Design a protein around this ligand. Structure first.
Ligand code: MAN
Ligand code: MAN
Ligand code: MAN
Ligand code: MAN
Lengths: 113, 96
């Protein structure tokens, strides 16, 4: 009995960050050729890339006459961009009172009599 | 020439999302035992959790009321250190 030659190296178990490959062979005319019908090796050992997605822009808002909006980037070290996602926009407001500044840009006034 | 019993499965290559582990055994009294000295199986196929980090708040801006905004960044990862929020970007133009 005798081993056949190796076939191709087949699919790596990972896209990045290290996985394994296998190749196979057949023991002809017997169940028990010396050694193993399958051989393994390392593949795609490169570290996974930093993938990025930007948030949507916030709405335009006045500066004082200029307007501005904001965004951020979300970054992750991932094999697959579908595994990275931007969540919902969250809005916080605060009441500035009828004078338009107390609790916002100004604190409570103190008057010494 | 005879194999020893299989050794225990080695540490999984991943904590989540599917990794691999190996078990081994030794052919005593010669090299040419029939069969294999290593086997692999899958391990930790539990999906990676969705890790979430909030962005900083934008500055307060007027709407009586002021408002600010944030988002969340989400990734399927084993390790929160691999998720990061980038720098705040401001776009500006004349107006309103
Ligand atoms: C197949 O495996 C090796 C050859 O690559 C030897 O142990 C022997 O030839 C066996 O049939
Ligand atoms: C398969 O492995 C190598 C070729 O890649 C050689 O030792 C031989 O061809 C074997 O069957
Ligand atoms: C070890 O592998 C198998 C038993 O697990 C047989 O091919 C033989 O006993 C060998 O020594
Ligand atoms: C390891 O594999 C199985 C048990 O897991 C048996 O064939 C034998 O115990 C071998 O050493």
């Amino acid at each position: 009995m005798f081993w056949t030659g190796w076939g191709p190296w087949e699919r790596c178990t990972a896209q990045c960050g290290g996985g394994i490959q296998a190749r196979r062979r057949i023991c002809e005319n017997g169940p028990d050729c010396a050694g193993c019908n399958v051989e393994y090796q390392s593949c795609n050992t490169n570290p996974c890339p930093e993938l990025k997605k930007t948030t949507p822009w916030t709405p335009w808002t006045p500066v004082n006459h200029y307007e501005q909006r904001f965004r951020y980037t979300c970054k992750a070290r991932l094999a697959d961009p579908n595994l990275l996602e931007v969540g919902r926009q969250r809005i916080e407001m605060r009441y500035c009172s009828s004078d338009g500044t107390s609790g916002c840009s100004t604190g409570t006034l103190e008057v010494l009599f």
